[PDB]
Design a protein around this ligand. Structure first.
Ligand SMILES: CCCCCCCO[C@H]1O[C@H](CO)[C@@H](O)[C@H](O)[C@@H]1O
Lengths: 279, 13
């Protein structure tokens, strides 16, 4: 009994440990969010399938690492879902063919927000999985420890909804003018969703965001967002109605807005935060 | 914040 990975590392007969580098594509599912499915990443085989049968379980102590350790989740091992980190060894999976077959493990994240997310830097430890192998022949009891590393920069969604982009940049025409903000949201299942804006503002209305450009900032101007022509103040929940699996647009358009005094030539920049909420 | 929008612009003359 031995194992291989897709990224080119293996653990021999007797067990050991190995580093697994995986491309992450986290998505929201209903009631739980997928972090990574390792069944296409890790494979094992039986060396004497005609005579011996290997028993493979997900040992206890299997946990998230790095930043994700602060979250509770579930793990799908061969069709049934168990709490993650595992506090108990899962039931056995039978292994009986020389051909390398998947280790059916998929790590999920329990939702905690509406559309929130957590940033994972590439090279980060994201999990430590322990595979315990035994048989019906002798008294063998081996450990295969898998250190899962993130191959890429990603945001793992922690909510029941997801955005088209976590960080957006749009460019206005030279003053005066406006431009649409392509930004949509979808949910794993139907949710009554809403969002509100965040940022530093210059007006009593709390709607005109300050120009925080570092070099040659144009004075007298700021940015103001609209939806259907209506100005959106900061910290005021914009209701979207029901949002399902189909992406729904936030309907935002960025416009210039005068702050006070003379408008002079120069750069304009405004960072605006968007937070989603259930209604 | 769940998402961040960066709006860039210029005033020319
Ligand atoms: C006297 C022949 C008995 C056979 C010896 C082969 C050793 O078995 C290997 O392969 C077995 C699975 O094919 C495992 O159960 C065992 O732990 C080890 O990985």
């Amino acid at each position: 009994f031995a194992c291989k990975t897709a990224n080119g590392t293996a653990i021999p007969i007797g067990g050991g440990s190995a580093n697994v580098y995986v491309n992450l594509a986290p998505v929201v599912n209903v009631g739980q969010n997928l972090v990574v499915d390792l069944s296409t990443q890790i494979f094992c085989h039986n060396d004497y399938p005609e005579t011996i049968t290997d028993y493979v379980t997900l040992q206890r102590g299997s946990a998230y690492g790095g930043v994700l350790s602060n979250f509770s989740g579930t793990v799908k091992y061969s069709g049934s879902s168990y709490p993650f980190p595992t506090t108990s060894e899962t039931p056995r999976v039978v292994y009986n063919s020389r051909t390398d077959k998947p280790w059916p493990v998929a790590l999920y994240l329990t939702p905690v927000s509406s559309a929130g997310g957590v940033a994972i830097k590439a090279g980060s430890l994201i999990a430590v999985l322990i595979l315990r192998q035994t048989n019906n022949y002798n008294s063998d009891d081996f450990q295969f420890v898998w250190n899962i590393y993130a191959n890429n920069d990603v945001v793992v969604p922690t909510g029941g909804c997801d955005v088209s982009a976590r960080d957006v940049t749009v460019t206005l025409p030279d003053y005066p003018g406006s431009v649409p903000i392509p930004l949509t949201v979808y949910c794993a299942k139907s949710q009554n969703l809403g969002y509100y804006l965040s940022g530093t503002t210059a007006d009593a209305g709390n709607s005109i965001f300050t120009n925080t450009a570092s070099f040659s900032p144009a004075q007298g101007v700021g940015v103001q967002l609209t939806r259907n022509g209506t100005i959106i103040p900061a910290n005021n929940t914009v209701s979207l109605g029901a949002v399902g699996t189909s992406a729904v647009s936030l309907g935002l358009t960025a416009n210039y807005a005068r702050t006070g005094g003379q408008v002079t030539a120069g750069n304009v920049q405004s960072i605006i935060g968007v937070t989603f909420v259930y209604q | 914040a769940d998402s961040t929008i960066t709006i860039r612009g210029y005033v020319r003359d």
